Amino acid sequence: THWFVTQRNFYEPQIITTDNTFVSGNCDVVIGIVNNTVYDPLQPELDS
Amino acid sequence: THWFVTQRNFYEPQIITTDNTFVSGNCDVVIGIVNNTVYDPLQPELDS
Ligand SMILES: *[C@@H]1O[C@H](CO)[C@@H](O[C@@H]2O[C@H](CO)[C@@H](O)[C@H](O)[C@H]2NC(C)=O)[C@H](O)[C@H]1NC(C)=O
Ligand SMILES: *[C@@H]1O[C@H](CO)[C@@H](O[C@@H]2O[C@H](CO)[C@@H](O)[C@H](O)[C@H]2NC(C)=O)[C@H](O)[C@H]1NC(C)=O
Ligand SMILES: *[C@@H]1O[C@H](CO)[C@@H](O[C@@H]2O[C@H](CO)[C@@H](O)[C@H](O)[C@H]2NC(C)=O)[C@H](O)[C@H]1NC(C)=O
Ligand SMILES: *[C@@H]1O[C@H](CO)[C@@H](O)[C@H](O)[C@H]1NC(C)=O
Ligand SMILES: *[C@@H]1O[C@H](CO)[C@@H](O)[C@H](O)[C@H]1NC(C)=O
């Protein structure tokens, strides 16, 4: 149901964020890409 | 008197921040943990 990012050699799931992930280009080029939220940790701070 | 994070093979003390550190869980589980202020680099910008 949920999407997580984890270290490779031990299951420690954590929320997808702009800290855990890096961008590269538009979605069409990658074979097998999937859709999700990526949380932006600035936004609750910016909002308050 | 003061707590720093340094690279391992050459002494270069840096202030402890949420950039040069990462979280995992509450303070109870770790044997030999210590208490200090992690400087959050966004707080002077939230003050601005
Ligand atoms: C996939 O993992 C997530 C995170 O552990 C599960 O979502 C939690 O599920 C429990 C039980 O239903 C709830 O109490 C939590 O509030 C849920 N957390 C969130 C952030 O939604 C999810 O149930 C797991 N999915 C499956 C199919 O096992
Ligand atoms: C992932 O999400 C994107 C954006 O919602 C989906 O792309 C759109 O898909 C529809 C139906 O095929 C097209 O009409 C649109 O032109 C697409 N692009 C945009 C920008 O809306 C995509 O289909 C989703 N992929 C999966 C596997 O669910
Ligand atoms: C590290 O800091 C925490 C938080 O101030 C200390 O936790 C307190 O410990 C006393 C022990 O008698 C408890 O009565 C308090 O309820 C605790 N506070 C909280 C907010 O839980 C902890 O003792 C400190 N550890 C060391 C080794 O100094
Ligand atoms: C994975 O295999 C299924 C087999 O039905 C196929 O439909 C799907 O296109 C494959 N995945 C990718 C990324 O092509
Ligand atoms: C560190 O070592 C000393 C001597 O072995 C012991 O008395 C002390 O309880 C230890 N403290 C921690 C935090 O491990």
UniProtKB/Swiss-Prot annotation, chains A, B:
Glycosylated position list: 35
Main function: Subunit of the fusion protein that is processed upon entry into the host cell. Mediates fusion of the virion and cellular membranes by functioning as a class I viral fusion protein. Contains a viral fusion peptide that is unmasked after S2 cleavage. This cleavage can occur at the cell membrane by host TMPRSS2 or during endocytosis by host CSTL. In either case, this triggers an extensive and irreversible conformational change that leads to fusion of the viral envelope with the cellular cytoplasmic membrane, releasing viral genomic RNA into the host cell cytoplasm.
Name of the protein in question: Spike protein S2'
Organism the protein comes from: Severe acute respiratory syndrome coronavirus 2
Residues of the full protein shown: 1100 to 1147 of 1273
